[PDB]
Write a protein that holds these residues in place. Structure first.
Motif, PDB file in Angstrom:
ATOM      1  N   UNK A  48       1.923   9.478   5.091  1.00  0.00           N
ATOM      2  CA  UNK A  48       3.045  10.075   4.519  1.00  0.00           C
ATOM      3  C   UNK A  48       3.264   9.970   2.971  1.00  0.00           C
ATOM      4  N   UNK A  49       2.451   8.946   2.467  1.00  0.00           N
ATOM      5  CA  UNK A  49       2.813   8.545   1.050  1.00  0.00           C
ATOM      6  C   UNK A  49       1.934   7.714   0.374  1.00  0.00           C
ATOM      7  N   UNK A  50       1.384   6.956   1.115  1.00  0.00           N
ATOM      8  CA  UNK A  50       0.325   6.066   0.749  1.00  0.00           C
ATOM      9  C   UNK A  50      -1.173   6.628   1.154  1.00  0.00           C
ATOM     10  N   UNK A  51      -1.003   7.674   1.889  1.00  0.00           N
ATOM     11  CA  UNK A  51      -2.273   8.111   2.415  1.00  0.00           C
ATOM     12  C   UNK A  51      -2.106  10.053   2.542  1.00  0.00           C
ATOM     13  N   UNK A  52      -0.891  10.207   2.832  1.00  0.00           N
ATOM     14  CA  UNK A  52      -0.597  11.820   2.775  1.00  0.00           C
ATOM     15  C   UNK A  52      -0.874  12.180   1.530  1.00  0.00           C
TER      16      UNK A  52
END
Length: 13
Positions: A2-6
């Protein structure tokens, strides 16, 4: 993911 992988998943959001 969601933000470090998304972002890497963001390609496939």
């Amino acid at each position: 993911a969601l933000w470090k992988t998304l972002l890497k998943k963001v390609l496939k959001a």
